[PDB]
Amino acid sequence: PMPLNLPPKSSKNTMPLVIAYNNAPEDDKIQKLFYLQKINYLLNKTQLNDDLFDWINDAEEGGWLNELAKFSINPNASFFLKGMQFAKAITEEIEVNIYHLMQERDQLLKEVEFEKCATRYAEINFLLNELALNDKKTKEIVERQTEILRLVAPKIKAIKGESIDNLPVINFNFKFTMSGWEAPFVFRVEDRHELGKEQELHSYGVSKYFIEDYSVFMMRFKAEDGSTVYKPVILSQFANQNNLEEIAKQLKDGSPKNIAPRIGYYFVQLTDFCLKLIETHNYHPDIKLNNFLVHNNRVLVSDRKTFTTNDNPLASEILTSPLFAPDEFLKCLLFNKEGDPVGYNRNALWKRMNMPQFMAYQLGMALKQFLILTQLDELPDDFRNPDHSAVSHFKTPSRQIINLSLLVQELTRLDPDKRMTIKQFQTLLNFKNLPPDAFYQKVEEVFP
């Protein structure tokens, strides 16, 4: 059986993995699959060149794509689905947390050779395939994503074969509708040169708040410097669901008995997103109601283009929304005659933001905006001012609205180091029913 062609000498980081794949015994399919998955893992965090791009697109015998086809692994599958296709092929040759499993497998693919982990590797992939077979949610995701990947395959082929001059030069995206699907589908180009960060994110539990991506592949584009560059192209369904700002406005014209329980439901999820993103050393600098949607009673972040890995960035290194921005960020901006931030002043070159206290403020301002849109048609002119609290706008306010309004004030204190943390907000969210003074006692206990 013809071996796998060695990677090009111009880009030979996968050389040891290819040699290990070829030296594995032909009937040792699990070791074949393990080094196939290691190559893919390293390819996903590799900047491509013309010679390596040719190598990953060789479907002739001895080519990378022919090795994948032997195990029904789709080179255009999403990070989640491609891992699951690996888990089924490995299982054929043989109560748990899927994100722990994916993280454990990724650590092996990152740094470990097959010698030191062969049986645990197959154990992980068996458990992953078990979830694909018995967990209703995982089974639905695999079935739906296999359906979409098959039916969009002509579109993937067409865009991959499109002339490079008909593509954009380096928020680029391509929209198309499919008969039978209401929401259109979108191909988008990412800003990063590789998928290393995307590959890691989908092994973390914060990806359950991500809009589902269906296909990932690299493509050649003309760059702004005249050269040709390779960028990731990711497919998803256009997100036409209501955002949280639209939902708050819906709750004003509904029964007031649903307001307090619906806020807790959405903000339990929003808080868990914030903390789980911080667990991966990532930060969302543009936290606001209209950047989150609800899809089948799940909160999803609208996009991840603004995520940052830096917990102490300069003002000029994060994109945010000034209306919901803390004062430490506003003091770094230069303003218009209309009152619009026009640019930066000298402060922005050295003044830094503490991201977890930045997110605490913006999460608290999203709660303030959610509470107010439940009572008023539009936000008041002085909505930023902590004098004008949220209960302020209520007439005969509920006990829950009193406790939630207090949490808003504790999350938006002018001094970042005096703000409540999202972790504390999570704990005290589960006590919004207790009477006002009793809620004040619990607040003092959790946040002295």
Side-chain angles (χ1 to χ4, degrees), residues 1-8 10-11 13-91 93-94 96-109 111-122 124-135 137-139 141-154 156 158-170 172-178 180-181 183-190 194-196 198-207 209-219 221-223 226-256 258-304 306-318 320-322 324-336 339-345 347-377 379-380 383-394 397-400 402-412 414-417 419-422 424-433 435-440 446-448:
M2 183 177 323
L4 169 57
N5 290 333
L6 300 167
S10 53
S11 193
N13 264 7
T14 45
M15 184 73 63
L17 306 180
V18 162
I19 290 166
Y21 177 80
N22 286 332
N23 284 152
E26 179 69 19
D27 69 321
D28 187 354
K29 301 306 190 190
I30 297 187
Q31 183 178 176
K32 291 296 186 157
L33 279 158
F34 167 88
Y35 286 108
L36 230 42
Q37 206 171 21
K38 264 187 96 83
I39 294 171
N40 177 74
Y41 189 85
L42 180 61
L43 280 176
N44 278 338
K45 59 207 291 178
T46 294
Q47 201 162 158
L48 266 53
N49 64 21
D50 298 314
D51 292 333
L52 182 54
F53 184 75
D54 298 356
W55 186 89
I56 68 173
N57 283 289
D58 188 357
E60 278 154 18
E61 219 190 348
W64 167 248
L65 292 179
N66 182 61
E67 301 301 329
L68 296 181
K70 297 175 185 203
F71 305 104
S72 310
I73 293 151
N74 197 323
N76 299 143
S78 70
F79 294 107
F80 172 73
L81 185 53
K82 201 183 288 183
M84 299 301 286
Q85 292 173 356
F86 270 105
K88 185 165 76 155
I90 296 163
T91 289
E93 317 274 24
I94 293 186
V96 75
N97 178 324
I98 190 167
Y99 303 103
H100 292 345
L101 292 186
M102 287 184 307
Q103 274 167 79
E104 198 189 337
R105 167 205 70 199
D106 277 19
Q107 190 273 326
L108 301 177
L109 301 173
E111 307 152 337
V112 183
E113 298 309 309
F114 188 74
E115 229 192 37
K116 308 165 185 285
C117 74
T119 48
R120 184 47 189 172
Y121 173 75
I124 296 168
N125 281 287
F126 176 87
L127 301 180
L128 285 176
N129 183 77
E130 280 293 299
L131 286 161
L133 292 182
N134 297 312
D135 177 27
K137 189 216 175 212
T138 304
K139 181 162 158 278
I141 295 179
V142 166
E143 274 180 5
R144 174 181 60 258
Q145 277 195 31
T146 305
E147 180 183 34
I148 285 177
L149 199 48
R150 194 202 300 118
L151 302 171
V152 85
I156 297 180
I159 193 55
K160 275 183 175 184
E162 185 64 62
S163 160
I164 203 175
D165 295 337
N166 280 344
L167 298 169
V169 183
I170 315 297
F172 304 104
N173 44 66
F174 181 78
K175 225 150 163 184
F176 67 94
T177 259
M178 296 234 296
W181 264 274
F185 289 81
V186 179
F187 281 118
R188 76 183 184 261
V189 186
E190 294 285 75
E194 34 86 65
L195 294 145
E198 279 285 315
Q199 179 161 256
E200 276 175 46
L201 285 172
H202 284 84
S203 65
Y204 291 124
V206 70
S207 57
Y209 300 105
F210 294 177
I211 286 168
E212 200 157 291
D213 289 328
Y214 295 120
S215 173
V216 182
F217 54 86
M218 307 291 303
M219 261 183 74
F221 300 92
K222 294 188 303 171
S227 53
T228 54
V229 67
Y230 294 94
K231 290 285 206 158
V233 175
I234 317 194
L235 171 79
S236 63
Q237 209 155 357
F238 182 79
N240 55 0
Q241 302 85 3
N242 300 144
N243 61 53
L244 287 177
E245 187 192 347
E246 292 168 323
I247 284 166
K249 297 189 154 177
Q250 278 164 18
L251 293 177
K252 172 173 152 14
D253 293 308
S255 351
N258 304 316
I259 294 167
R262 281 273 97 169
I263 289 188
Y265 183 71
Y266 292 139
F267 272 78
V268 154
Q269 284 183 59
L270 271 181
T271 289
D272 188 34
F273 163 80
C274 282
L275 297 176
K276 276 177 164 45
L277 185 73
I278 295 167
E279 277 169 11
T280 82
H281 215 270
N282 283 273
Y283 311 91
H284 191 342
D286 197 12
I287 293 182
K288 61 179 167 168
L289 283 194
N290 63 39
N291 277 341
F292 298 96
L293 322 161
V294 173
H295 181 185
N296 294 130
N297 278 152
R298 290 309 299 178
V299 172
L300 305 182
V301 68
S302 66
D303 68 67
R304 323 183 285 279
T306 56
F307 288 9
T308 181
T309 47
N310 190 2
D311 60 354
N312 273 279
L314 292 178
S316 46
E317 301 175 344
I318 50 169
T320 195
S321 310
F324 310 103
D327 206 77
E328 66 256 30
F329 182 87
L330 294 184
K331 288 298 176 180
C332 301
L333 301 178
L334 187 82
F335 283 84
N336 207 7
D340 300 349
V342 125
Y344 298 99
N345 42 35
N347 291 333
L349 307 180
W350 68 73
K351 169 68 166 177
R352 279 179 192 279
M353 275 28 115
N354 189 271
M355 274 313 125
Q357 305 169 158
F358 192 102
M359 288 166 61
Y361 179 93
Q362 284 196 321
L363 174 61
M365 288 297 271
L367 181 51
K368 203 193 196 181
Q369 184 194 26
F370 203 113
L371 289 161
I372 292 178
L373 286 183
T374 274
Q375 307 291 333
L376 298 182
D377 290 320
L379 278 186
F383 148 82
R384 292 193 43 77
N385 193 323
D387 284 335
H388 322 139
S389 83
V391 277
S392 144
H393 306 94
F394 289 55
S398 149
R399 166 176 47 249
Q400 285 99 354
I402 283 164
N403 305 333
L404 290 167
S405 187
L406 178 64
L407 296 180
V408 175
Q409 299 298 101
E410 288 312 317
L411 283 161
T412 47
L414 172 72
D415 176 77
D417 278 291
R419 268 167 221 163
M420 183 178 193
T421 63
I422 298 172
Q424 289 161 351
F425 176 70
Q426 177 167 69
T427 313
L428 281 173
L429 250 195
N430 313 333
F431 290 95
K432 64 177 186 305
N433 290 318
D437 320 306
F439 182 82
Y440 173 76
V446 182
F447 172 60

